[PDB]
């Protein structure tokens, strides 16, 4: 577990509907939500991969489980029952444990994605912003929608705003 | 000027199970286990099954008098709880189960 | 008159999922029988509103 979902970020956003992970910006031009399309698509692709692996690896084949034996073949009937019961126990245990494992893997994958988004934004901003702690960042320099689109894109220009941020720090 | 990082949340009630936690609500889930049937015997591999209404395989193969009411190919045979009209004359059907196995999937 | 891949004494089964709960005795390419009640695979985030 990485510490983001149900942790440093204490809650999800119902208002954000364009993706699984995203940003909420508060400026002088207005507030808003904006999803991170790339991370969301990567997550969608990998979850689709996991579902496909779980489903499309069974390799079933034609069979007729039921067999009929007369009253003088009780041993063979009991052997058939033993085979059926053994397969049932194996498959039920494997299915339960597999689902239980993949569920934690999926949830931890999502938590890691959120943490990585946070770390990328933090490394971009450096000391130009202050970490409040809720998962938010307050800018020391007034920067508009272009600045936040650059931060989301990954092209924040640190030396451009370094001088302005130094004064207010 | 603030920029917050967050994640999606909805009003989903769907619950999954984890090795560490039970009754965990999630935004979406898929089903790996279906428990619904159409309540309806139907064709397998395209070929319709052979239905034996009141007869069994012994009666049908021997031509019981109560069986003229009843296919070149079939996928499987269907019996019924009231399939009692078989060997009307008392006796033994030698290797009857073997015959049932050999007659199940003719082409 | 249907077209099914898996048949059980109580009906046909859509063989698209790996596991089945309906009936042990089966004819055809059938999902594996498990004595379980719920098998849900998580695909989205944990819901924390």
């Amino acid at each position, epitope marked *: 577990l990485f510490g983001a979902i149900a942790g440093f970020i204490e809650g999800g956003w119902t208002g954000m*509907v*364009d993706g699984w992970y995203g940003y909420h910006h508060q400026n002088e031009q207005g507030s808003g939500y904006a999803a991170d399309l790339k991370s969301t698509q990567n997550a969608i*692709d990998k979850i*689709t991969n996991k579902v496909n692996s779980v489903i*499309e690896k069974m390799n079933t084949q034609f069979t007729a489980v039921g067999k009929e034996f007369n009253h003088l073949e009780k041993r063979i009937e009991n052997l058939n029952k033993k085979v059926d019961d053994g397969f049932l126990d194996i498959w039920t245990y494997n299915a339960e444990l597999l689902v239980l494992l993949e569920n934690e893997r999926t949830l931890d994958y999502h938590d890691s994605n959120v943490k990585n988004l946070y770390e990328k934004v933090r490394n971009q901003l450096k000391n130009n912003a202050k970490e409040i702690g809720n998962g938010c960042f307050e800018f020391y320099h007034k920067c508009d929608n272009t600045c936040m689109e650059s931060v989301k894109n990954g092209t924040y220009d640190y030396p451009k705003y370094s001088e302005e941020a130094k004064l207010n720090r | 000027d603030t920029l917050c990082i967050g994640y999606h949340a*909805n009003n989903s009630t769907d619950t999954v199970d984890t090795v560490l936690e039970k009754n965990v609500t999630v*935004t*979406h889930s898929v089903n790996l286990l279906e428990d619904k049937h159409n309540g309806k015997l139907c064709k397998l591999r395209g070929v319709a099954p052979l239905h034996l209404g009141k007869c069994n395989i012994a009666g049908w193969i021997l031509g019981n008098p109560e069986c003229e009411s009843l296919a070149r190919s079939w996928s499987y045979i269907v019996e019924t709880s009231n399939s009692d009209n078989g060997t009307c004359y008392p006796g033994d059907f030698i290797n009857y189960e073997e015959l049932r196995e050999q007659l199940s999937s003719v082409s | 008159d249907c077209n099914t891949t898996c048949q059980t004494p109580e009906g046909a089964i859509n063989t698209s999922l790996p596991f089945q709960n309906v009936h042990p005795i089966t004819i055809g390419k059938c999902p594996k029988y498990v004595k379980s009640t719920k098998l849900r695979l998580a695909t989205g985030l944990r819901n924390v509103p």
Partner: antibody
Amino acid sequence: EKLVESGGGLVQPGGSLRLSCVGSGFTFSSTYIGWVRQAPGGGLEWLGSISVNGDITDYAESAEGRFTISKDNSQNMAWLQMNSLRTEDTARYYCATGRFFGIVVTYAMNLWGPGVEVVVSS
Amino acid sequence: VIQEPAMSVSPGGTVTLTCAFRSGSVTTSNYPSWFQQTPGQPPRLLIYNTNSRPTGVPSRFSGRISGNKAALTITGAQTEDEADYFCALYKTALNVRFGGGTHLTVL
């Protein structure tokens, strides 16, 4: 998750028509709606699309100036309004959207309605 | 948007369908999408975002961007893969353009 379309039928040339797409299993406040038609002989032709928030709507060259797309989230419905129909608009119309694991993907169209027949003959 | 009007495949064979612009190059930012349509049914999405394959699509469908054109490859074409194939390319997020379908025939 289903989309069902209604509102088609016979229209005289130069007339107007209104088509409704209704969604079941998901909320329209979390999805975009695209309208695409298919001529009886021919291929798919994208007509228009309305965004998730409803603020941005985009139309094709053959649909700009005549067609209006609107979305009501409360009723979970989307309306395509046709004005000044010609005889080239006789087609089967479709409302589509992209939804993967409960979220919207704008560059995908995997949820499709059955379509509704629109015939424009004099 | 340009596609080849018709292609032919032998059962169990491999085919590639090509989608390309009329006055430009096709790249990832255009988000190629591939659709399979039978004449009397609504279209079905096979590949989205050049690579991605939605759940339920058979694994024999793959997509890529070869040179300056998107390619949809069917490996091991079965009898059920006989349908029309459309390609969709995006200029902006919402603006789409379909191409004239390619009619694939299984021999």
